[PDB]
């Protein structure tokens, strides 16, 4: 295939690659004007019997691989929430591709576990959550883990809530099928809660119910408590409440100071959603919204959002962490080692066996940027939203339907659905800008996320003037 | 802080300790002579306010990082099943790293999909799969995505079965709780299957029962057809079976073609689980195993295994994508697009939200060592399994108490099984080589798995003579 020294050519002209790529993504269109289907004409239909030559291999991510990429990295990226990438995390997964170690358990690569039990630690600490997330605080029985995705995270607090639950049930009534117990379960969120709330509890088969907000878009604990009520009238059981800091449409915030004494009350496992917003909490300044922190069971964010480390990186701390093991616990003696009882085996705090070191990236980051500058960047970052939301403010053809707290502005055109619905169609054409919208009540909005850890003010009002330009043409129509 | 000609200096160190890494790794003591809690007080509490020095983030791979690896990429790693980077793996996902673009949908990041589609045809084909696992065969209702491992690909397989046969029974109960009816469900595997299938089990609550395996380890059809009768009288409801090709503990294959004939008349959901063998079906003359493949609904195999991708990468094909995205489908506003219902995204075919570009490496794999060279691949680590088993055959003290396939061999000291025990405790005081246990009937066994592949003769002699080594102290006793 290839042989070291060649590697290192190669190697080296791939670092050169993507040092252009990152540094003039602005030049690119956002958004491919592609045709669902369009590359398999373009690629052979079997596999090369002989090697490719590297020259074509390479040659072929312009030709026909970067014609259909989203450029997520441009500063002219505005959909979803950020996805950020940086030298440092580049560097970090570099290595640890290289080492390609797995660490189901201790024992199967300590460092792989070890390292990422330290930095769980240290990234706890700089979000202000709660000592007994720490796995080395004496008074915690709980810890960081990492996982791939949020929506995996809010998955494994839904299964750990139920099979704790079901157990308790089943103490009282050893001849009820855990499936059977199952049923009577009820789980809860905002109705602006993310939609991998939903798919949790599909996958899970547990009863989800999706509550009312208040006039900031917020779940209070008027509306839990109500539906609590209800649905013990009924005679289902409460078993589950995630609240959400950050909501995906509008960035709203779950008032956490209400839900929280409910839920401890109650005795519902509490999950908060911080995605997007847990970044922000780098920051002391945001953490108002992690009022009541302390009431929850588990606690997920995305550094693969804002953070600057590429995608896969969620964090998962949960108060529990035996609660967590007995949810997932198998023992095959083909896994078994010397240190199962003292070591920390990651394997029982996540849905598969293997997983990989993904914390190299993380230490990378974290080092390599400081927590001051990465505090400049969520506050820059913020600023940069500021501005454009103020553009937006300021245009008497336009209004913002909900609060800007961080780095996502909401807005819309007067007038019906319609004309937003077409600007965003316009703006499509040309692909200078990816945005997309979501609804609030009956209302159409249109999301534009600050990204880029490089936005600037020229950025900002580049795209606000496109935006600007397509709402011209439409109401010109 | 690190600017873009900084990342440019440390990309080229990068690469360059990973070809050194790499091409030396030999010389490293496989397992790290380290106590669980070994990390922590070699590293500051907190994170650092300000940058770090590059220097010292380097220095620190060698004087932090590597004393708790297990060297994974060491021809003398012969643990678990391999997992395997390579160079062309590396430079593959460094550019997806720094495009880190998300294909939730085909709109977040068409390429990303659409590589990820053809290159899933490719290894359809390589692997000799049907043409219903193809996405673009005419008739096909199927197709192939990748997943991070075979655990979460068997969850997968397991709640789609389940969520069709439950859809099914609320037609004649149109009343029950979807939960209540999933208690009446029964799930089978092998005695050998892999602990992901119990973990399954736990995890979907549906029950899971093990069958027992012929003199060759292999799950045979009047097993199942006895399970399933016994079951009916019983009440209960069969909707699943995971066949293994290639089990943990010794490599069996269960008997396909009679479990085929049975899933299909009986209605069973049949899912492949072919994590380290299915490699080995890169070459026709070990496609015999894969005989009834036609019956399965579902099928997994590990490239991060065998095939020389770096971790992670599983590939998961189904026949009836459909079923699939019963399973998970969410229809929220801000995740549609104008392509919605004809392009495919992949957030149906998978438990969470957001998925990577993984099949850049995939395809740069295959397309760097080419067919040919993976199936020399293939055969050169099971010719120097071969050599292994012919080691061990030659010495009466041992014994092989199961065949040999591929590249793994398992054996054991002929006597009480605290000899062979007392062998592998031998072997770990050194750690100059890596091996683990397993259990068949009620014999301790040691693995020998064949890994790197620049595993060569003199490697493999050198690492029996360890074994004799320590079974001539041991012996003497
Ligand atoms: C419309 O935007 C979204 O749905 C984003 C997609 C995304 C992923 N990374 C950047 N943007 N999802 C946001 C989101 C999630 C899903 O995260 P994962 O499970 O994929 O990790 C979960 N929770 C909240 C509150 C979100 O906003
Ligand atoms: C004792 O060794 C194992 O359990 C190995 C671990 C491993 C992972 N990569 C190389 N070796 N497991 C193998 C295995 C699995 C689990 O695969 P993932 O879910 O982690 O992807 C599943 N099925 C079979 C048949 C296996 O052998």
Redesign the interface.
Same mark, same amino acid.
């Given at each position: 295939?290839?042989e070291?020294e060649?590697?290192?050519e190669?190697?080296?002209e791939?670092?050169?690659?993507?040092?252009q790529?990152?540094?003039t993504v602005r030049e690119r269109r956002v958004?491919?004007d592609?045709?669902?289907?369009?590359?398999?004409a373009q690629?052979p239909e079997?596999?090369?019997?002989?090697?490719?030559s590297?020259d074509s291999?390479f040659g072929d991510?312009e030709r026909i691989?970067?014609?259909?990429?989203?450029?997520?990295?441009s500063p002219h990226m505005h959909?979803?929430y950020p996805?950020?990438?940086?030298?440092?995390?580049?560097?970090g997964?570099?290595?640890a591709?290289?080492?390609?170690?797995?660490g189901f358990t201790?024992? !199967? #690569?300590?460092?792989?576990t070890? &390292?990422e039990?330290?930095v769980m630690?240290?990234?706890a600490?700089?979000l202000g959550l709660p000592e007994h997330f720490l796995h080395?605080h004496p008074s915690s029985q709980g810890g960081g883990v990492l996982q791939?995705?949020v929506?995996?995270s809010t998955?494994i607090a839904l299964?750990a809530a139920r099979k704790n639950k079901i157990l308790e049930m089943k103490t009282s009534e050893p001849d009820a099928?855990?499936?059977?117990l199952?049923?009577r379960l009820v789980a809860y969120a905002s109705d602006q809660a993310? !939609? #991998?709330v939903?798919?949790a509890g &599909?996958?899970s088969?547990?009863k989800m119910k999706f509550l009312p907000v208040d006039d900031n878009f917020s779940l209070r604990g008027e509306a839990l408590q109500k539906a609590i009520e209800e649905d013990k009238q009924r005679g289902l059981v409460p078993v589950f409440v995630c609240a959400t800091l950050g909501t995906?449409?509008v960035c709203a915030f779950d008032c956490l100071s209400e839900l929280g004494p409910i839920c401890a009350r109650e005795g519902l496992w509490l999950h908060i959603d911080a995605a997007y917003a847990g970044t922000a909490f780098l920051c002391p300044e945001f953490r108002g919204f992690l009022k009541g922190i302390e009431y929850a069971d588990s606690f997920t964010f995305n550094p693969?959002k804002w953070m600057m480390v590429?995608?896969?990186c969620t964090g998962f701390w949960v108060k529990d962490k035996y609660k967590l093991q007995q949810?997932?616990?198998?023992?095959?003696?083909?896994?078994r080692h010397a240190?199962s009882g003292?070591?920390?085996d990651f394997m029982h705090w996540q849905?598969?066996?293997?997983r990989?070191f993904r914390s190299?990236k993380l230490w990378?980051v974290?080092?390599?940027?400081?927590?001051?500058?990465l505090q400049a960047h969520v506050r820059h970052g913020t600023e940069m939203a500021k501005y454009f939301e103020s553009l937006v403010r300021n245009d008497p053809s336009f209004e913002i339907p909900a609060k800007r707290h961080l780095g996502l502005v909401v807005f819309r055109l007067k007038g019906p659905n319609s004309l937003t619905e077409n600007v965003l169609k316009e703006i499509?054409k040309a692909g200078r800008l990816f945005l997309?919208?979501?609804?609030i009540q009956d209302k159409l909005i249109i999301?534009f996320t600050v990204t880029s850890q490089f936005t600037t003010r020229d950025d900002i009002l580049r795209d606000w003037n496109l935006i600007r330009d397509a709402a011209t043409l439409i109401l010109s129509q």
């Open positions: 295939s290839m070291p060649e590697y290192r190669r190697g080296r791939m670092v050169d690659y993507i040092c790529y990152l540094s958004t491919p592609v045709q669902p289907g369009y590359l398999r690629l079997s596999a090369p019997e002989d090697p490719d590297w291999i991510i691989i970067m014609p259909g990429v989203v450029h997520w990295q959909a979803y996805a950020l990438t940086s030298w440092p995390s580049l560097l997964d570099m290595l591709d290289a080492i390609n170690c797995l201790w024992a !199967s #690569s300590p460092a792989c070890e &390292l039990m330290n630690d240290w990234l600490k700089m080395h791939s995705t929506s995996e998955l299964l099928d855990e499936s059977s199952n049923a993310h !939609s #991998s939903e798919k &599909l996958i088969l547990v995906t449409g693969s590429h995608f896969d949810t997932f616990s198998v023992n095959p003696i083909y896994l240190n003292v070591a920390t849905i598969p066996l293997s990989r190299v990378f974290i080092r390599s940027f400081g927590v001051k500058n499509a997309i919208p979501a609804t999301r």
